[PDB]
Structure 1
Amino acid sequence: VTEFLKPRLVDIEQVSSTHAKVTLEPLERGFGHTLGNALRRILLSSMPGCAVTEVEIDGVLHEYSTKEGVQEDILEILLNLKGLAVRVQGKDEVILTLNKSGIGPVTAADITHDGDVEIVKPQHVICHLTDENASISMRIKVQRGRGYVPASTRIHSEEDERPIGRLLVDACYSPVERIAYNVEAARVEQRTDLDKLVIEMETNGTIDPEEAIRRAATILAEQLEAFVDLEVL
């Protein structure tokens, strides 16, 4: 009559590896859009991602050079490596080593298998080796962050980057790509005017959908609790 019906989430249609479709069933009137645009802005704004930051290729000084025996320029290898989605499972920062020799493409499956680092798609090409006795070796530094952190604001105190042969990539620690909520009618029996918010996220693979919604509602309620205890001035 006046209390409310509280939303509880219901089934998580993992309709692809990256796609997802969550549904929040017994929603009250008008809180559909209120929670929907809140969760779209929160999910799209700030989630914990595990993008890469520093690549130290073996015989490479700077990214504006080429490398002999490889087909992309080094800058194109960095642009391929920025889009490498990778879910670190145990810690904060980690270093991935890639060693590959001989002709063929280099997918990300050739990255040395760690326990706590799970490459989500091993089909993702990195660079194209084009010679028989040509090889590559790099230490991809993967660390966990939040939001777009470019390389310009990355270098605060130079962080002892005295090796010149270490390249710095811009970071995009944000697993989500699109959210699109959708309200409709909720067919509970003894009620007509309810909603059922159907959030349809599209991650890159690192984040779980339920953990995406759980971190989103958590971070909203924790920003909220400067109000529920008002503390007037």
Structure 2
Amino acid sequence: TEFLKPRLVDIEQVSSTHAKVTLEPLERGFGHTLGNALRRILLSSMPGCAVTEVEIDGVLHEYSTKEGVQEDILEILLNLKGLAVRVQGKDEVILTLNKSGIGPVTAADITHDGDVEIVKPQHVICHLTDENASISMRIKVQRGRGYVPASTRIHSEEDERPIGRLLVDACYSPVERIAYNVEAARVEQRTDLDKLVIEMETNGTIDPEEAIRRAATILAEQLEAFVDL
């Protein structure tokens, strides 16, 4: 039994959302083996913090108009779906955003709280285009993994959905980009020891090191099942 156990030898926040990470030392072929699995696990398994709710100051449906605004309501939903946030020690929360007068809107405008985190305050939100114009909307956030369509969600909830509450599809994954490379680096002052590098892009909601360790832990759960014969 000659295996040297790899370790997350280095981490790199190359960008505030894009990160690099490397694992070493790795036995022959294992880098490819772990690399494929870890890539697959991360994309599917990672737990996400995402928004699915819209409460608005008087419109009644996705297709409604709005006074003194640059865009239609539905386009607002698309922007919100793009928006992402991280929440501290919570499962769900409601946020609100209020603006008035002629101006464009950004995530920073939200009624932020210290126990909530906005990954990109500069993220674009629909604009106001009248002096008397004003917006005051409320949105709820949830923790989940994977994706869910809006229609399926309500049918599972089955409780009355009041008018003025609008539904959007949940896209939880905190990250969607994976590239990993296997390279030879020097351990045991000899060849045939492998070095692995991973890199990914994220919406910033999670720490990359937590991602790999959380993913690896998850994979261990399924792997342990094979001992249960």
TM-score w.r.t. structure 1 length? 0.95
Distance in 2, Cα, partners of 1:215 & 1:109: 30
Deviations 1:192-224 (A, max 9, x none): 101111000111100110011011101100111
Deviations 1:37-74 (A, max 9, x none): 10100011121111100111111100111111111100
Let me know the Cα RMSD of the aligned residues: 1.2
Distance in 2, Cα, partners of 1:204 & 1:194: 34
Distance in 2, Cα, partners of 1:161 & 1:185: 59
The offset of 1:157, in angstroms, is 4.5
Residues 218 and 124 of structure 1, relative CA distance in 2, 3 Å threshold: same
Residues 23 and 157 of structure 1, relative CA distance in 2, 3 Å threshold: closer
Q: Partner of 1:42: helix, strand, or coil?
A: helix
The offset of 1:3, in angstroms, is 2.6
Residues 5 and 158 of structure 1, relative CA distance in 2, 3 Å threshold: closer
Distance in 1, Cα, partners of 2:66 & 2:87: 29
TM-score w.r.t. structure 2 length? 0.96
Distance in 1, Cα, partners of 2:188 & 2:33: 24
Residues 163 and 192 of structure 1, relative CA distance in 2, 3 Å threshold: same
Distance in 2, Cα, partners of 1:118 & 1:96: 11
Q: Partner of 1:222: helix, strand, or coil?
A: helix
Distance in 1, Cα, partners of 2:162 & 2:106: 27
Distance in 2, Cα, partners of 1:161 & 1:204: 33
Deviations 1:150-191 (A, max 9, x none): 102111254434321000111100011101110010212432
Residues 155 and 27 of structure 1, relative CA distance in 2, 3 Å threshold: same
Distance in 1, Cα, partners of 2:179 & 2:143: 25
- Give the aligned length: 229
Residues 93 and 161 of structure 1, relative CA distance in 2, 3 Å threshold: farther
Residues 170 and 176 of structure 1, relative CA distance in 2, 3 Å threshold: same
Point out the more displaced range, 149-158 or 39-48.
149-158
Deviations 1:11-54 (A, max 9, x none): 11100011000000111110000000101000111211111001
Q: Partner of 1:157: helix, strand, or coil?
A: helix
Distance in 2, Cα, partners of 1:60 & 1:217: 45
Residues 161 and 136 of structure 1, relative CA distance in 2, 3 Å threshold: farther
What does residue 23 of structure 1 align with? 22
What does residue 210 of structure 1 align with? 209
Structure 2: gaps (5+ residues)? none
Identity of aligned residues (%): 100
Higher strand share: 2
Distance in 1, Cα, partners of 2:226 & 2:23: 25
Q: Partner of 2:55: helix, strand, or coil?
A: strand
